[PDB]
Each structure stands twice: as structure tokens, then as C-alpha cells.
Amino acid sequence: NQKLIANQFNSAIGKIQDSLSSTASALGKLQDVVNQNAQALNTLVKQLSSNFGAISSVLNDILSRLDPPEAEVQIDRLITGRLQSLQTYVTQQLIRAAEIRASANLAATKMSECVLGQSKRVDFCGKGYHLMSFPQSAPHGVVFLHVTYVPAQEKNFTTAPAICHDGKAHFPREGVFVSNGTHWFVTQRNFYEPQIITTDNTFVSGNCDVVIGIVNNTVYDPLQPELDS
Amino acid sequence: VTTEILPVSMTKTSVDCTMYICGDSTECSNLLLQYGSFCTQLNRALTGIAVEQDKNTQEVFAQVKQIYKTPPIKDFGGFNFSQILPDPSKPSKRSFIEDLLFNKVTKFNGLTVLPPLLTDEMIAQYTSALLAGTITSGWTFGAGAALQIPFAMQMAYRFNGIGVTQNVLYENQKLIANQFNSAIGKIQDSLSSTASALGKLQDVVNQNAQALNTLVKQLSSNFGAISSVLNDILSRLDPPEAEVQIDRLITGRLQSLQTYVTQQLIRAAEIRASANLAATKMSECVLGQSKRVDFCGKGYHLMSFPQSAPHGVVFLHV
Amino acid sequence: FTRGVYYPDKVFRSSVLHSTQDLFLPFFSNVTWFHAIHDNPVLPFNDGVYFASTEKSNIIRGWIFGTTLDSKTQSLLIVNNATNVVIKVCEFQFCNDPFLGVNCTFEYVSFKNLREFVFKNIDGYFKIYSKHTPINLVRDLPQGFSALEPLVDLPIGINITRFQTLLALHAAYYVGYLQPRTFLLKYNENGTITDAVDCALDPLSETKCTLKSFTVEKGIYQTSNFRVQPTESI
Amino acid sequence: DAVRDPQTLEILDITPCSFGGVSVITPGTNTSNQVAVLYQDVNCTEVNVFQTRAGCLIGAEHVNNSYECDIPIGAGICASYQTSQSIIAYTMSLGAENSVAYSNNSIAIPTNFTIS
Ligand SMILES: *[C@@H]1O[C@H](CO)[C@@H](O[C@@H]2O[C@H](CO)[C@@H](O)[C@H](O)[C@H]2NC(C)=O)[C@H](O)[C@H]1NC(C)=O
Ligand SMILES: *[C@@H]1O[C@H](CO)[C@@H](O[C@@H]2O[C@H](CO)[C@@H](O)[C@H](O)[C@H]2NC(C)=O)[C@H](O)[C@H]1NC(C)=O
Ligand SMILES: *[C@@H]1O[C@H](CO)[C@@H](O[C@@H]2O[C@H](CO)[C@@H](O)[C@H](O)[C@H]2NC(C)=O)[C@H](O)[C@H]1NC(C)=O
Ligand SMILES: *[C@@H]1O[C@H](CO)[C@@H](O[C@@H]2O[C@H](CO)[C@@H](O)[C@H](O)[C@H]2NC(C)=O)[C@H](O)[C@H]1NC(C)=O
Ligand SMILES: *[C@@H]1O[C@H](CO)[C@@H](O[C@@H]2O[C@H](CO)[C@@H](O)[C@H](O)[C@H]2NC(C)=O)[C@H](O)[C@H]1NC(C)=O
Ligand SMILES: *[C@@H]1O[C@H](CO)[C@@H](O)[C@H](O)[C@H]1NC(C)=O
Ligand SMILES: *[C@@H]1O[C@H](CO)[C@@H](O)[C@H](O)[C@H]1NC(C)=O
Ligand SMILES: *[C@@H]1O[C@H](CO)[C@@H](O)[C@H](O)[C@H]1NC(C)=O
Ligand SMILES: *[C@@H]1O[C@H](CO)[C@@H](O)[C@H](O)[C@H]1NC(C)=O
Ligand SMILES: *[C@@H]1O[C@H](CO)[C@@H](O)[C@H](O)[C@H]1NC(C)=O
Ligand SMILES: *[C@@H]1O[C@H](CO)[C@@H](O)[C@H](O)[C@H]1NC(C)=O
Ligand SMILES: *[C@@H]1O[C@H](CO)[C@@H](O)[C@H](O)[C@H]1NC(C)=O
Ligand SMILES: *[C@@H]1O[C@H](CO)[C@@H](O)[C@H](O)[C@H]1NC(C)=O
Ligand SMILES: *[C@@H]1O[C@H](CO)[C@@H](O)[C@H](O)[C@H]1NC(C)=O
Ligand SMILES: *[C@@H]1O[C@H](CO)[C@@H](O)[C@H](O)[C@H]1NC(C)=O
């Protein structure tokens, strides 16, 4: 299916562009960081206009009007308010920085365990079975394009945990036993690709009196016809 | 089967900074305005916390696109899940075990509490969907469509995933189902008798209750004023003197809120980290199978089942 | 509508949304409509007055402010006759019904047209704001927005509770009242107020003032606090 | 908390007059200037009225149909602007209901795939 896969991949990327080019909210996680920091600074600057109990928020207006014995009192009121304002700002920046650091740590983890490797961790690198990922830069952040394998179409098959041959219980080495209503096949779990059940597909352990739901079939031995002819 | 308990959320408190500092007082409010945005930026910080509390809940539980439900016939290969599946006879369709969890974990000063967006009933529906998915379709519902599979076969895959050949399961299916069923009964006996079992969630409730009680008690402090009661200052002093006494209370009460909010932001970060962990486990524990050691309990992980709890999630790791 | 907004102070601002509390005419409030066809009563001044008039022939030429307006107290008189604006604050003897045909402490001498004014008294200072603009409307006040600049500030020290207008007889006018509302004023790049939000007009306006913006993004915002008021004291 | 009346010696409880936060629920102003108002944690007494556990919601129409959550109110209730258009309130949907056709001998195996 290489042509199909390449075409689906190429189409999926085109869809990414259409989404990013039209949905502003797509980058809300990065835009929000910018907005929170802008708001923090605007708040800090606006606090300079506050009196905090002083006759004026403007320091030069206090100094140009009062002698030191009185000016110092009015100034101390502004210093306390403005010093308190910075402490509030810095505390918020430290807490916010911790949030960003945690995100950066996550991003670094994904880069290593998503871009440089292949993730067996579920929904770590997008919904579906992770194949590969590609990083893209963004303002103050990283964007990952996660390429995943998603089952698309399915059929209802009858199944069994094991098959009886000569009284021996045969289990799949890989895959499951399936039935289309008339014939039993063995196939890989994540993609329907029925194969004849043979001794090279299954293994034997125990017998038919133990396994619950074991069914009768035949298991083909590839050696027989070579010795038979 | 082991039980791992994680906090997901914290009470969405909200404090009216003006009413807290200057409750029903015009004279005090006008003085408070001289502090600029000091009041409203605290209202903002607490709102930010309240909002992420719904985000935390949503990221942990709403990981399934559809609400799955088990069949009326519980033919799960001998595995009894009746104590983790929803009970139809209750006013809220929670499982027996969830009820146990909910039964163990337990003003006018501008302090109010906002409800969560997702009610306990909605959380129960999500854990039900995740559980029904886990039981009837294994991990396929996580990746894409929920693809039905006999439970015993699902377990066979879970066994191959830990390096044990699938014939072991089938040959010992009765033993395995019996051990599983017994293990769940043990979970109930532990949760029903050990109050400390839910200490991680009870502690969150206690820390938040303590933070609010501390904040309210601070209103009784004078902070250098002649009285902690604002009305007693105003009813006794003319403005030129009342304003001085009030400024002393405003500074103390404004400082008290700032202390409270800072502690809530730091505590919220701790809860967020826990919620992120819980969300990670849900995806890499309930929806899948973990190859990560001691990530989903001690031993070789097979499968896990979520259960809701007050402000948190409880995982039963098999 | 949105009339009755004036520059609150003498500071230049530009490209900014500024929140201020002052005596403004509340948005979409009722203003009494008087006529001058084929109507110069004494009106209350309350806490300040918004005045507006529409002209085609300059009929409205003046104002009287005071308590009794009968030579018993000082009363501010403003008259504009041809090209000369006259302001006096004498204990004038006014007619039983003052009109103009076609112990003084101060004296000064200098539809198609809408002339808006604001008259307010703060600590004895009579503050006058105004704006003249061309119009093409006879029936009523034109809808739209225009801010009024200050022109005059008279330290008269007169207790004003009532006022009356002066008409030229051979032009409708409106009287509104100001309230201590908070407004968000939008200054454009030239420092001109081009829009405004009355923060107590409705919940949406409250939201706009809270967020300091004339645009509100989709969502739920906490803007205020509901409080039941007492009816009587015990 | 309470006082003894100085003229007649009986005890009166003092309960502060009803109050609560007020939130405005709005579609962006680039869509509509219609809003709904939520009075937080109050009854629809002291304040097209819908009583929720989040408070008294006024101006939003209560709709029986669930939808995906848009502007959250709380306690399972979300609001949105829909049809002629107005603000509506509803209990949010948690997703479509989909039973799995489970049986002890039936397996669904994908026959095709998509790369996303
Ligand atoms: C199950 O699969 C088998 C094998 O493909 C189907 O059997 C074949 O049917 C075709 C006709 O479509 C015949 O030409 C082949 O000779 C048959 N092969 C054998 C080995 O008998 C069978 O019909 C399928 N069953 C169902 C219910 O679809
Ligand atoms: C699978 O095939 C075996 C034979 O290979 C069946 O065994 C029979 O079981 C019945 C019931 O006890 C006995 O009466 C017969 O004598 C057994 N036959 C032989 C040859 O021993 C078995 O029942 C089959 N199972 C299914 C589900 O069809
Ligand atoms: C799953 O286990 C429960 C017990 O937790 C079983 O329910 C009990 O059934 C017996 C009868 O056999 C009653 O006497 C008990 O009172 C029931 N207890 C409860 C709590 O319901 C249930 O039948 C088992 N289910 C399966 C399929 O084995
Ligand atoms: C301005 O003048 C008015 C009267 O024109 C004064 O109002 C009176 O106030 C007294 C109390 O001091 C009341 O008993 C009268 O009934 C009021 N009169 C009216 C008509 O309401 C007003 O107090 C004066 N302002 C100042 C600052 O002195
Ligand atoms: C798997 O699904 C793809 C589509 O996602 C199928 O490819 C399409 O086949 C139809 C004809 O039936 C064409 O009209 C489309 O243009 C094809 N799309 C693409 C992207 O190639 C594919 O045939 C299916 N495979 C199987 C085995 O069923
Ligand atoms: C499998 O059978 C169920 C029976 O309820 C049906 O609803 C479902 O669509 C079937 N699946 C397929 C892929 O045909
Ligand atoms: C599967 O379920 C059917 C009932 O629908 C029952 O008769 C049959 O014996 C069961 N088989 C197994 C292996 O449990
Ligand atoms: C304005 O006057 C109209 C009557 O013409 C009345 O219905 C309306 O309620 C009044 N509005 C205000 C704010 O006074
Ligand atoms: C305007 O009135 C004044 C008296 O107050 C008078 O002296 C003057 O002549 C009048 N008009 C003009 C155009 O001069
Ligand atoms: C001017 O004011 C004085 C009070 O100082 C008063 O006695 C006098 O009668 C006033 N003049 C007139 C003309 O009323
Ligand atoms: C400022 O005034 C100039 C005229 O000198 C005009 O061209 C320009 O558009 C004005 N700016 C705004 C924002 O109205
Ligand atoms: C108040 O008046 C009543 C009579 O109506 C009397 O009985 C009571 O003792 C008085 N209270 C006080 C405190 O004097
Ligand atoms: C928002 O309104 C402006 C008009 O000021 C319009 O040009 C723009 O396309 C609108 N955008 C949306 C998303 O409705
Ligand atoms: C509102 O008051 C009524 C009684 O009139 C009561 O039945 C109802 O439960 C109250 N609702 C809330 C939300 O308090
Ligand atoms: C919901 O439907 C019921 C009828 O089953 C009706 O009585 C009720 O008024 C409806 N509610 C709304 C909000 O439409």
C-alpha cells in the first residue's frame, strides 16, 4: 500500500496548512502566553499612577512641593506601594515561569521520545498508533506534527482462542483466528489479511479438553505434500 | 489489584477582594481605590485558578470521544466487573466502589465557591465509558474505533505484552478469573475500612479549608487599628481620623488576600501537576497497556480501570 | 442616545481607552424636549445640566442660573446678541417672563446648527463645555457621537438650583441631567474622543468597562457584584 | 452574628442581605450584542429565567437538546448562541452514545487504515 500511504500522508499535510491558515485559535496556547505576560507588564506600569495614600502618584510633584521632612512621608507611601507592586509582579512571573518550564520539559521529552524515536506510549504523540513526528518552530514554542496510523474500516469476524487438530490445541504465534462463516484463517491483529492456518503460523500447547471456546478445524502441514509427492 | 489515588482538582473558590476588605463601606472602598489594580488583579488570579480546575478535570476524564456501555449480558470469560461498573438502581449511576470512595472523602465575607463544570454524574458517565471501552474493546477504542473482542482474548494479548505466552491464560483462565474476582473483593474491604486510604484527596480538601479559615480569621485582626470592625471605626471617628485607622485595616486585609492568593496559585500548580499525571496514566494505563515499570502499580501491568472520587481519580491497576 | 460626553480634564491623551468617573449624561436616558413654535420654563438644575439646542435662526440666545432668579440673589446671565457674548453675575431683576425681543461680582464681553452645552457646579465653579456642529434635521436631536471641549470656568460661588433659558422673539431645546457615572472613553490617534461606554447602561457595557475594551470576546466574564440594598433604617 | 433587642429582650439573627458575583455570558460582539446574565449562587427571587446550581440565569432560553459545551456556566450547564438566533442554555453532551457489539466469539478486525 505504499502509494496509498504516501498519498494519505501528502493529503494530511495539506490539511494541516488549511487549518493553520484559517483557524486563529489553533495557536491559542502560544498566544495566551504572550497575552498573560503583556497583561502582567501593563498592570505593573499602570500601578505607577496610583497614589497609595500619597498626595500624588507623581514623585516629582511631591518633591517640587514639599520640604524633605514632609516629602519623605509622602514618598514612603509611594515606595511601599510600588515595592509591593513589584513583589506581586515578580511572584506571578515565578509561578508562571514554572508553568512554562513544565511545558518546556514536556516538549523536550516529546522531542526525544516522539521525533528522535517512536512512541509506544498511548496518546503521548497524538491519537492513534504513533509512527513518526516532525517538529516545527513557532514564536516562543514548538509545534509537533504527529503522524499516526488509524484503523479505518472494519469487519465482524467469528473468532476462537484456539484450534483443535489431532486433539492438540493450536494457538497463533501472532495474530488471531478468524472465521468468515465457512473457513478459519489466521491474521494479524491490526489489519485483516487472512492466511491459511498452518503449523508455521501456530504453536501447540496442551490439548482440546482445557481451552474454553476452542473450535475444530484443520491445521495444514507444509511438509506433508513434499513427502507425499 | 492495587489502588492508586490521585488528586485532579481543587475547590473553585472565588473571593470578592472589595467586599472582603471594605464590606459595605463607601468610605473604605474609596480609600481602597487608591491602591489601583491591587484588588482586581487578585480577582483575576483566582479566576485563572478556577478555570484551570475544569481544564484539569476535562483532560483526565474526557479522553473518550463516545460514551460506551457494556452489554446486558456480562459474558466476560468469568471475570466479574459488577463492582466497578455503574449500578442502575442508584440516583446517580456510580459503581459500588465509587460509592465507597465518595463516602470516605468529606461565608458572608465575599468568599464564595463556584461549582465545577462537570458534575459528579458526568464524571461517572466518563469513567463508565472508559471502563466499558476497556472491557469490551481493549485498547482499540483509544486509537480509533472500539473494536469488540472476547474478554478472554483481550487478556491473551495483555499476557503476551508482558512476555507470557497466551496459552498460559487459556489453560489457567479459571484461576486467573478467580484471582481477579478475589482481588476486587479485597479492594472493597480495604476502602470500606481504611479511612487513610483516601488521604491524598482528603488532604487537598483540608488544605483548602484551612486556607479559607485562615483568611476569614484575619478579618478579626486590628493590624494596628483601634478596631478590627470597620463599622466601629466609622461610627466613632470623623473622616480625617477614620481614614487613618481604615488604611491600617486595608493594608492588613489586602496583604492577607495577597498571601492567600499566592498560596492558592502555588497549590494549584501542585494539583495541576497531579492532574497531568492522572491524565497521562489514563491514556497510558487505561486506554493502553504500560511497559513502563511501576507506572501502573508494582508488577507487570495488564490493564487498569478508572473510578471517580471527590476531586480526583482512583485507578485500579491489574 | 450617546450625547453628553465631554473631555473630563485638560490632559492630552491619544490612542488609549481611559476610565473616568464624572458627571456625564447617562446613555439613552430621557431628556425633556421643549419647543419654540406658534416655552422657557424654569427647570431644576439638580447636580448639573446637559443642554442642547437646534437652530436655524439663532433664537436661543441665553441662560439664567440661580435659586429665585428675581433680584433677590445673584444669578448668572449669559447672552449672545449678534457677535457679542456677554456674561454677568449681578442680582438682576428679571421679568415675570424673561425674553429678548428682535451687587455685581463679574462681567465679561466678547435645523442647520446643533449647539450642545454642559453646565455643572463644583465647589462654586461654574464649568461650561460646548460643541457646535452642522446638522440637517428638524424633528429631533441627531443620533451620533461628538465630545464637548471645555471653554469657560467661572468662580462665581453661586448656589444654583434652578435655571431658565432666553429666547429671541419676533428652535427646540433639550434638558438632561448629569450623573456620577463611570465612562470608558476612547481617544483616537489625534486625541479626539470618538466613542464611549456608559458602564451602568447594561450588562454588556459593564463587561466592556471591566475588560477595558470596546470589543468583547466570546465567553463568560465576571463583571460585578449583586447586592440587595436596605429599604429603611432601624 | 446576632443581637439582643435593647427594648424587648429577644434575640435577633443577622443574616447579611443577598449578594453574589454577576457574570455576563456573551457571544463575541463580532456576532451579537445580546447577552445573558448569571447571578452567581442566588435564587431567582431577590434578583426567560432558568434556575441552575450555578446561580439564576436570565436571558438564556432553556433548551432540552444537549450540545457540545461552548460557553460554560457550571454544574453541567453551558450556553451558546443558536436558532432568529438567541442565547440558549442546556445540559452539555458528553459525546455520542455508542454501544459495543460485544459477544464471547466476535472480533472486529480493521480491513483498511488511514494515515492522519
Ligand atoms: C471464506 O473464504 C474462502 C476462501 O477465500 C471462500 O471460499 C472460496 O470461494 C470462492 C468463490 O467466491 C471459490 O472460487 C473458491 O474456490 C473457494 N475456496 C475454498 C477453499 O473453498 C469462502 O466462500 C468464504 N466464505 C464466506 C462466507 O464469504
Ligand atoms: C471436535 O472434534 C472432536 C473429535 O475430533 C469431537 O469429539 C467427540 O465428542 C462427542 C461428545 O462427547 C463424543 O460422543 C464423540 O465420540 C467424540 N469424537 C471422537 C472422535 O472422539 C468434539 O465434540 C468436537 N467439538 C466440537 C465443538 O464440535
Ligand atoms: C459478581 O460478584 C457479586 C458479589 O460481589 C455477585 O452478586 C451476589 O450474588 C449472590 C448470589 O449468588 C447474592 O447472594 C449476593 O447478595 C450478591 N451480592 C451483590 C453485592 O450483588 C454477582 O452475582 C457476581 N456476578 C457474576 C457474573 O459472577
Ligand atoms: C441652595 O439653595 C437651596 C434653596 O433654594 C437650599 O435648599 C434648602 O435647604 C434647607 C436645609 O438647609 C431645607 O430646609 C430647604 O427646604 C431647602 N429648600 C429647597 C427648595 O429644597 C440649599 O441648601 C442651598 N445650598 C447650600 C449649599 O446651602
Ligand atoms: C482504503 O481506503 C482508501 C480511501 O481512504 C481507498 O482508496 C480510494 O479508492 C476509491 C475507489 O473505491 C477512489 O475513488 C479514491 O480516490 C481512493 N483514495 C485514495 C486516497 O487513494 C482504498 O482503495 C481502500 N483500500 C481497501 C483495501 O479497501
Ligand atoms: C457488527 O455487528 C453489530 C451488531 O449489533 C452491528 O451493529 C455492527 O455494525 C457490525 N459491524 C460491522 C463492521 O459490520
Ligand atoms: C458463548 O455464548 C453462548 C451464548 O450466546 C454460549 O452458548 C456458548 O457456550 C459460549 N461459549 C463460550 C466459549 O463461552
Ligand atoms: C422615557 O420615557 C418613556 C415614555 O415616553 C418611558 O416609557 C421610559 O420608561 C422612560 N425611560 C427612562 C429611563 O426614564
Ligand atoms: C448686547 O447687549 C449689551 C448689554 O448687555 C449692549 O450694550 C450691546 O450693545 C448689545 N449688542 C451688541 C451687538 O453690541
Ligand atoms: C448688596 O449686599 C449687601 C450685603 O453686604 C446688602 O445689604 C445690600 O442691600 C445689597 N444691595 C442691593 C442693591 O440689594
Ligand atoms: C488627524 O487629523 C488629520 C488632519 O490634519 C486627518 O487627516 C487624520 O485622519 C486625523 N486622524 C484621525 C485618527 O482622525
Ligand atoms: C421598653 O418599653 C416597654 C414598654 O412598652 C418596657 O416594658 C420595657 O422594659 C422598656 N425597655 C427598657 C430597656 O427600658
Ligand atoms: C468582525 O467584524 C469586522 C467588521 O468590523 C469584519 O470585517 C470581520 O470579517 C468580522 N469577523 C468575524 C470572524 O466575524
Ligand atoms: C428558591 O426558593 C424556593 C422556595 O420559594 C425553593 O423551593 C427553591 O429550592 C430555591 N432554590 C434555590 C436554588 O435556592
Ligand atoms: C422538555 O420536555 C418536557 C416533556 O417531556 C417538557 O415538559 C419540558 O417543558 C421541556 N423543557 C424545555 C426546556 O423545553
Side-chain angles (χ1 to χ4, degrees):
Chain A
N1 294 287
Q2 184 173 336
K3 289 180 181 178
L4 176 62
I5 291 164
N7 286 336
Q8 289 177 347
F9 175 76
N10 293 340
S11 294
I13 296 298
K15 289 178 182 178
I16 297 300
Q17 292 178 334
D18 288 346
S19 178
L20 291 172
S21 296
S22 63
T23 300
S25 66
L27 273 287
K29 288 182 177 181
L30 269 47
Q31 185 65 9
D32 188 62
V33 172
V34 172
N35 287 343
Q36 289 183 38
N37 289 326
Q39 184 64 52
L41 290 172
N42 287 338
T43 300
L44 181 62
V45 173
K46 287 178 180 180
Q47 287 299 98
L48 291 169
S49 72
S50 293
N51 290 334
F52 304 112
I55 62 172
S56 175
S57 71
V58 178
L59 183 59
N60 288 349
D61 290 341
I62 293 167
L63 291 168
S64 72
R65 291 189 291 162
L66 301 177
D67 289 339
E70 297 179 359
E72 289 177 359
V73 172
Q74 297 301 312
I75 294 167
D76 282 346
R77 291 178 189 179
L78 293 178
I79 291 169
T80 298
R82 289 175 174 181
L83 181 58
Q84 184 180 16
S85 181
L86 288 169
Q87 289 171 345
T88 299
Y89 172 80
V90 173
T91 298
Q92 295 298 307
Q93 292 294 99
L94 289 167
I95 294 168
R96 187 177 296 109
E99 181 177 358
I100 296 297
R101 187 173 66 249
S103 182
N105 286 343
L106 176 60
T109 298
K110 290 186 192 301
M111 192 70 81
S112 292
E113 300 180 44
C114 202
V115 175
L116 273 62
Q118 181 174 15
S119 174
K120 299 291 283 181
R121 295 172 64 187
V122 173
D123 300 349
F124 183 67
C125 294
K127 187 181 83 77
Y129 296 96
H130 182 249
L131 296 173
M132 61 183 175
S133 297
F134 305 115
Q136 299 281 267
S137 67
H140 294 295
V142 66
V143 179
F144 293 94
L145 303 179
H146 301 301
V147 183
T148 62
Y149 175 95
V150 180
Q153 299 183 323
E154 314 96 32
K155 292 182 181 180
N156 287 347
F157 296 100
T158 298
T159 189
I163 288 172
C164 289
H165 183 65
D166 293 320
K168 295 187 268 279
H170 294 252
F171 300 89
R173 287 187 171 85
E174 298 183 359
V176 296
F177 293 129
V178 299
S179 169
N180 71 357
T182 63
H183 292 76
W184 287 92
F185 303 98
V186 59
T187 192
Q188 66 186 312
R189 288 190 286 271
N190 294 298
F191 188 78
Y192 185 64
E193 184 180 66
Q195 299 181 320
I196 299 301
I197 299 167
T198 75
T199 60
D200 293 333
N201 291 326
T202 67
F203 68 92
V204 177
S205 180
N207 63 59
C208 295
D209 292 330
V210 178
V211 176
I212 298 168
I214 194 163
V215 301
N216 276 315
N217 207 52
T218 64
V219 179
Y220 174 76
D221 183 346
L223 184 62
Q224 179 66 35
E226 295 297 322
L227 273 50
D228 201 86
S229 176
Chain B
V1 180
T2 66
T3 301
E4 184 171 16
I5 300 166
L6 301 172
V8 174
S9 62
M10 59 181 275
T11 299
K12 292 167 65 176
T13 65
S14 176
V15 179
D16 176 343
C17 62
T18 301
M19 185 174 174
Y20 175 82
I21 297 168
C22 298
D24 298 331
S25 174
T26 299
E27 295 80 7
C28 183
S29 180
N30 287 343
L31 292 169
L32 184 59
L33 292 173
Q34 294 180 343
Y35 290 86
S37 68
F38 267 133
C39 193
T40 58
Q41 72 181 282
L42 296 172
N43 289 343
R44 183 181 296 111
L46 291 172
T47 298
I49 293 169
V51 172
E52 75 182 50
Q53 297 313 301
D54 288 307
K55 182 177 176 180
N56 288 341
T57 298
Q58 190 68 5
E59 288 186 347
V60 174
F61 293 100
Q63 296 188 356
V64 63
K65 66 174 187 176
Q66 288 178 320
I67 305 302
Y68 296 110
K69 62 184 183 181
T70 56
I73 302 168
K74 305 294 181 290
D75 50 347
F76 297 120
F79 290 80
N80 192 336
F81 299 116
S82 68
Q83 303 303 297
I84 60 169
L85 294 169
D87 183 341
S89 295
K90 300 295 183 72
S92 179
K93 294 181 179 179
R94 300 194 301 212
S95 64
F96 184 95
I97 289 169
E98 286 170 302
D99 282 340
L100 295 175
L101 297 171
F102 278 85
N103 292 331
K104 294 296 185 187
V105 176
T106 60
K107 182 179 175 183
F108 299 126
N109 293 299
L111 278 57
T112 67
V113 177
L114 301 171
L117 181 59
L118 282 77
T119 62
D120 288 346
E121 182 177 3
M122 288 179 165
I123 300 300
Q125 289 179 33
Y126 276 130
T127 57
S128 179
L130 291 166
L131 177 57
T134 299
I135 293 167
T136 65
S137 63
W139 45 74
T140 67
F141 80 94
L147 306 184
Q148 71 271 23
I149 186 168
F151 191 75
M153 290 177 69
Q154 178 174 310
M155 288 300 288
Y157 302 173
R158 300 267 176 185
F159 271 65
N160 285 340
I162 61 166
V164 179
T165 303
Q166 68 189 295
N167 66 294
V168 172
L169 170 65
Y170 294 117
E171 292 174 15
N172 294 287
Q173 184 173 336
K174 289 180 181 178
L175 176 62
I176 291 164
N178 286 337
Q179 289 177 347
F180 175 76
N181 293 340
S182 294
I184 296 298
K186 289 178 182 178
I187 297 300
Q188 292 178 334
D189 288 346
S190 178
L191 291 172
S192 296
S193 63
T194 300
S196 66
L198 273 287
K200 288 182 177 181
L201 269 47
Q202 185 65 9
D203 188 62
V204 172
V205 172
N206 287 343
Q207 289 183 38
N208 289 326
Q210 184 64 52
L212 290 172
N213 287 338
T214 300
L215 181 62
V216 173
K217 287 178 180 180
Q218 287 299 98
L219 291 169
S220 72
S221 293
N222 290 334
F223 304 112
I226 62 172
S227 175
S228 71
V229 178
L230 183 59
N231 288 349
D232 290 341
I233 293 167
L234 291 168
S235 72
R236 291 189 291 161
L237 301 177
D238 289 339
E241 297 179 359
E243 289 177 359
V244 172
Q245 297 301 312
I246 294 167
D247 282 346
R248 291 178 189 179
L249 293 178
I250 291 169
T251 298
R253 289 175 174 181
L254 181 58
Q255 184 180 16
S256 181
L257 288 169
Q258 289 171 345
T259 299
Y260 172 80
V261 173
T262 298
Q263 295 298 307
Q264 292 294 99
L265 289 167
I266 294 168
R267 187 177 296 109
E270 181 177 358
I271 296 297
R272 186 173 66 249
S274 182
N276 286 343
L277 176 60
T280 299
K281 290 186 192 301
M282 192 70 81
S283 292
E284 300 180 44
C285 202
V286 175
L287 273 62
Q289 181 174 15
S290 174
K291 299 291 283 181
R292 295 172 64 187
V293 173
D294 300 349
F295 183 67
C296 294
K298 187 181 83 77
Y300 296 96
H301 182 249
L302 296 173
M303 61 183 175
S304 297
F305 305 115
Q307 299 282 267
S308 67
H311 294 295
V313 66
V314 179
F315 293 94
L316 303 179
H317 301 301
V318 183
Chain C
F1 295 105
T2 58
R3 303 294 186 178
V5 176
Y6 60 88
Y7 292 81
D9 63 21
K10 298 184 170 71
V11 174
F12 178 82
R13 296 181 180 81
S14 63
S15 300
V16 64
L17 308 181
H18 179 69
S19 174
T20 183
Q21 182 177 24
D22 208 330
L23 302 175
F24 293 95
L25 185 67
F27 277 10
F28 297 98
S29 67
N30 282 346
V31 300
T32 304
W33 179 12
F34 301 89
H35 297 262
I37 63 172
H38 295 292
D39 194 11
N40 60 337
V42 177
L43 293 322
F45 190 79
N46 297 337
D47 295 321
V49 175
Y50 173 79
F51 184 98
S53 62
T54 58
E55 293 285 358
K56 63 185 180 180
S57 59
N58 197 29
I59 298 301
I60 298 164
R61 296 184 185 177
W63 297 264
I64 304 168
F65 302 86
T67 61
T68 59
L69 286 72
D70 58 359
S71 194
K72 295 179 188 175
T73 191
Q74 300 86 48
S75 176
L76 174 66
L77 173 65
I78 301 169
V79 179
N80 187 28
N81 54 358
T83 60
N84 288 173
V85 176
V86 179
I87 301 172
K88 296 181 179 179
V89 297
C90 303
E91 296 183 356
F92 284 106
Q93 178 68 69
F94 289 112
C95 300
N96 289 341
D97 184 0
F99 65 90
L100 179 68
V102 176
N103 284 25
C104 302
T105 62
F106 177 89
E107 178 176 2
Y108 167 83
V109 179
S110 295
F111 294 108
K112 300 297 185 182
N113 293 286
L114 171 64
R115 298 187 292 166
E116 298 183 327
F117 300 82
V118 178
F119 302 103
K120 65 181 187 179
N121 285 284
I122 300 172
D123 299 331
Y125 294 84
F126 189 88
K127 297 175 187 286
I128 302 170
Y129 306 75
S130 68
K131 175 71 178 176
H132 299 181
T133 183
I135 61 167
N136 295 280
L137 179 64
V138 72
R139 185 176 64 252
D140 210 341
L141 288 172
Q143 182 174 2
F145 182 86
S146 181
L148 278 56
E149 68 274 11
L151 299 178
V152 178
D153 185 336
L154 307 175
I156 64 176
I158 297 173
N159 175 33
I160 297 166
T161 63
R162 297 184 178 91
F163 75 99
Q164 188 169 32
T165 192
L166 294 164
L167 307 177
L169 311 180
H170 291 281
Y173 67 92
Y174 306 84
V175 177
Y177 297 93
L178 308 176
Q179 294 183 8
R181 300 295 186 95
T182 299
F183 278 73
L184 182 67
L185 305 176
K186 179 176 179 180
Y187 292 84
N188 70 6
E189 296 83 4
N190 292 11
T192 297
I193 299 168
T194 60
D195 206 342
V197 179
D198 180 333
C199 300
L201 179 59
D202 58 31
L204 180 58
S205 295
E206 290 171 358
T207 301
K208 287 178 178 180
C209 289
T210 297
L211 301 175
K212 303 291 187 296
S213 183
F214 284 59
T215 300
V216 177
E217 296 85 355
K218 183 161 171 277
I220 182 169
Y221 300 90
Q222 183 172 289
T223 64
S224 194
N225 292 286
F226 174 72
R227 293 186 295 277
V228 173
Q229 302 300 302
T231 299
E232 63 180 303
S233 65
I234 306 297
Chain D
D1 183 55
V3 296
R4 184 169 62 181
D5 179 304
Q7 294 182 357
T8 175
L9 303 180
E10 66 177 1
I11 307 305
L12 307 174
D13 283 341
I14 301 170
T15 299
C17 300
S18 176
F19 69 93
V22 180
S23 294
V24 180
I25 298 161
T26 184
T29 56
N30 231 85
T31 299
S32 179
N33 291 325
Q34 184 176 35
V35 302
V37 178
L38 176 69
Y39 293 85
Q40 295 173 11
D41 200 26
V42 301
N43 203 339
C44 296
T45 55
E46 284 87 6
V47 176
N48 197 26
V49 180
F50 179 28
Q51 182 75 64
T52 73
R53 290 187 175 191
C56 183
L57 178 64
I58 301 173
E61 183 179 2
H62 185 205
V63 176
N64 264 344
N65 296 323
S66 65
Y67 304 87
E68 291 185 2
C69 188
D70 186 359
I71 300 169
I73 293 173
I77 304 300
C78 298
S80 68
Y81 187 69
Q82 295 186 254
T83 58
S84 64
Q85 293 178 301
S86 69
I87 297 168
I88 62 170
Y90 52 87
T91 300
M92 64 178 182
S93 177
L94 303 182
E97 185 177 356
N98 185 12
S99 64
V100 178
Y102 179 86
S103 67
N104 55 340
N105 63 350
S106 180
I107 188 165
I109 299 168
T111 63
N112 202 349
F113 64 87
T114 181
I115 306 303
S116 64

